[PDB]
Amino acid sequence: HMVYPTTLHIIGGQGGNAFSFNGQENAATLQKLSVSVGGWQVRGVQVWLTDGRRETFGAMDSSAKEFEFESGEFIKSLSLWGNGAGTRLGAIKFITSRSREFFAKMTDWGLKTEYKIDVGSGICLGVQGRGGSDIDSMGFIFINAIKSSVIQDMKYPTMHQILPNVQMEEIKEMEYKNDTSIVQSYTFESSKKIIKKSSWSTTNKIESTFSLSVKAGIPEVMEVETGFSFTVGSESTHAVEESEEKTETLTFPVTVPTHKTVTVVANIGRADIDLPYTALLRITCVNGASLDAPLSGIYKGLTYTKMTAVATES
Amino acid sequence: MVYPTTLHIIGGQGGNAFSFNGQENAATLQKLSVSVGGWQVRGVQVWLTDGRRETFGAMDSSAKEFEFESGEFIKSLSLWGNGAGTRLGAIKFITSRSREFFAKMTDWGLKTEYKIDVGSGICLGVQGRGGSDIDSMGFIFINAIKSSVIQDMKYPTMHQILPNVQMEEIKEMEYKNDTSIVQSYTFESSKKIIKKSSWSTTNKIESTFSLSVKAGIPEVMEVETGFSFTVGSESTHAVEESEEKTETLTFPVTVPTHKTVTVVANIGRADIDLPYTALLRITCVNGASLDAPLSGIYKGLTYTKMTAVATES
Ligand SMILES: [Cl-]
Ligand SMILES: [Cl-]
Ligand SMILES: [Cl-]
Numbered sequence: 001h002m003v004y005p006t007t008l009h010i011i012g013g014q015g016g017n018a019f020s021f022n023g024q025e026n027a028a029t030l031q032k033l034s035v036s037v038g039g040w041q042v043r044g045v046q047v048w049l050t051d052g053r054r055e056t057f058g059a060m061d062s063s064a065k066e067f068e069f070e071s072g073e074f075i076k077s078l079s080l081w082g083n084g085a086g087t088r089l090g091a092i093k094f095i096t097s098r099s100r101e102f103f104a105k106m107t108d109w110g111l112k113t114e115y116k117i118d119v120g121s122g123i124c125l126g127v128q129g130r131g132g133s134d135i136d137s138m139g140f141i142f143i144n145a146i147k148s149s150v151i152q153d154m155k156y157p158t159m160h161q162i163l164p165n166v167q168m169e170e171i172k173e174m175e176y177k178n179d180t181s182i183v184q185s186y187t188f189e190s191s192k193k194i195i196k197k198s199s200w201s202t203t204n205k206i207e208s209t210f211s212l213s214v215k216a217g218i219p220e221v222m223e224v225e226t227g228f229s230f231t232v233g234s235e236s237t238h239a240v241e242e243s244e245e246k247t248e249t250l251t252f253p254v255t256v257p258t259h260k261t262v263t264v265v266a267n268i269g270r271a272d273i274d275l276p277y278t279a280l281l282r283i284t285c286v287n288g289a290s291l292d293a294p295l296s297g298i299y300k301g302l303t304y305t306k307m308t309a310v311a312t313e314s
Numbered sequence: 315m316v317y318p319t320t321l322h323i324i325g326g327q328g329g330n331a332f333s334f335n336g337q338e339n340a341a342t343l344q345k346l347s348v349s350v351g352g353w354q355v356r357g358v359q360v361w362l363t364d365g366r367r368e369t370f371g372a373m374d375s376s377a378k379e380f381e382f383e384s385g386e387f388i389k390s391l392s393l394w395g396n397g398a399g400t401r402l403g404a405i406k407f408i409t410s411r412s413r414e415f416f417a418k419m420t421d422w423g424l425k426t427e428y429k430i431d432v433g434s435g436i437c438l439g440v441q442g443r444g445g446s447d448i449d450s451m452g453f454i455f456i457n458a459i460k461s462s463v464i465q466d467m468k469y470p471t472m473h474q475i476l477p478n479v480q481m482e483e484i485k486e487m488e489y490k491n492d493t494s495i496v497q498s499y500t501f502e503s504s505k506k507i508i509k510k511s512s513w514s515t516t517n518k519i520e521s522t523f524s525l526s527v528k529a530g531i532p533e534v535m536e537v538e539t540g541f542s543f544t545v546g547s548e549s550t551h552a553v554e555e556s557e558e559k560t561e562t563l564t565f566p567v568t569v570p571t572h573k574t575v576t577v578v579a580n581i582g583r584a585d586i587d588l589p590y591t592a593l594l595r596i597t598c599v600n601g602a603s604l605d606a607p608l609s610g611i612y613k614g615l616t617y618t619k620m621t622a623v624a625t626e627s
């Protein structure tokens with residue numbers, strides 16, 4: 001018993017030359033459809049995907065009726081009609097997740113048997129069928145009902161060759177003046193609110209179409225003896241665009257020699273991070289089949305080091 | 315013994331005591347204006363983030379002011395006596411964004427600069443003594459902060475208002491059985507949903523502190539009467555949070571001979587708008603703490619699980 005990540009039910013005749021306009025390999029999906037109608041057939045379709053690809057099948061006159069999907073709008077239901085003879089595609093009807101309707105039909109011959117299509121998830125990867133002068137046959141490729149959409153195998157392939165730009169900023173300054181002849185001891189304390197940020201760029205509307213999560217560690221900064229290095233922290237699950245608020249702290253004892261002053265300044269390092277990334281988008285269906293698409297882009301991040309301090313005697 | 319605030323008052327012995335402090339509601343210093351004479355600080359006017367405003371001593375045309383930006387705190391502060399040590403003589407501070415404010419006496423020698431421990435740099439107000447002039451003053455600071463957590467979350471009107479669950483359709487399919495025996499099919503559906511939670515805050519606590527909320531979310535729950543609100547499992551949240559997920563439905567469809575069953579997948583969506591009360595707790599690095607009661611509105615968006623109506627023709 002085999003299961004599949006996509007579903008395709010083609011309708012019409014046996015004529016024409018095979019065509020396939022599929023955004024499967026990069027998770028590109030149907031953005032816009034334009035349909036031209038003849039007397040006894042669908043004459044042509046123009047189809048746009050979310051990655052910019054645009055293709056025409058059959059032929060397009062100016063009876064052309066269009067529909068552009070909104071971001072996050074999917075297909076609730078779809079019906080295809082043959083032309084009655086069983087030799088052409090006769091009509092296309094769909095209704096979206098937002099109740100918007102699109103209907104393109106034969107002008108001359110009336111419609112006959114209506115095939116109601118299982119749309120799976122309603123997320124369409126494009127179309128497949130046969131065409132020449134007309135659309136002999138066509139179906140819509142759908143991803144079956146989705147269980148999860150996770151970006152994983154996260155890599156920062158240039159991180160190992162780049163140094164962090166860490167800018168220091170002062171947080172607090174305090175002075176202790178010992179004008180006695182007994183050593184003194186105080187406790188210094190300081191805190192700072194910080195907001196860390198992580199963004200993975202996405203394309204082809206995958207952020208609005210799929211509920212994305214990212215299983216990965218994020219770029220952090222490590223202070224070593226020589227300077228600063230990039231590492232990647234513990235793996236966890238993230239939104240594609242995320243921020244984390246936190247309070248950093250620092251405390252230590254300060255010993256103040258007899259007849260001396262010590263001045264303490266607390267600082268933190270802040271790094272804007274801009275790095276290319278590679279990962280894979282795995283879409284896993286309810287049925288257990290899956291779809292992988294390689295991803296490439298830019299990680300933008302904001303991070304901080306731990307707080308430090310300089311104590312100087314005067 | 316340890317305290318959640320630190321206060322060091324500089325100046326003379328004279329005048330009447332004042333304390334102008336946002337501790338009880340975690341309101342902080344928004345703005346300060348200071349008037350100076352020849353041998354003293356003449357007056358201060360202070361505004362907190364909850365709209366309170368008060369003046370001590372006397373204000374005149376000499377006055378110079380400083381208004382804090384959101385998220386700006388104090389990095390360093392010095393105060394000087396007047397060098398007779400009868401009055402406050404000067405105030406100086408530098409912020410977390412390196413803006414400076416200095417106001418002093420016009421004559422006279424400033425003598426010993428007292429460099430002040432500003433704790434966390436988050437100022438709750440001022441305290442000192444004043445008559446005609448500012449005899450003495452200090453700034454009240456929260457000591458260094460370890461955490462800032464909103465807890466004991468309650469929704470008091472929750473049991474008294476009924477959810478408004480609007481239903482949406484997700485998927486329709488038709489199963490026609492033109493055969494002489496019963497047929498069985500699998501129907502599957504999925505939908506991306508965005509859940510949202512939002513606890514209102516005031517007095518800039520959201521930009522001064524890094525807030526987290528330890529609490530359950532209002533959710534919708536099913537009974538025979540229909541739908542009521544309930545509070546979910548407890549976890550840690552940001553004040554303003556969204557959670558993306560994919561809801562799914564799978565069930566078998568049985569179609570009698572020469573019958574059609576039409577299956578519509580739906581989901582229920584509820585906007586929530588409820589009053590809340592809670593406690594802001596600020597815990598210091600030193601182990602002390604500061605509690606402030608909170609009130610506001612919780613806004614939310616939640617979803618029921620997916621369901622399906624199967625209708626026999
Ligand atoms: Cl299909
Ligand atoms: Cl100290
Ligand atoms: Cl007095």
Ligand SMILES: [Cl-]
Pocket residue numbers: 195245520521
């Ligand atoms: Cl914030």
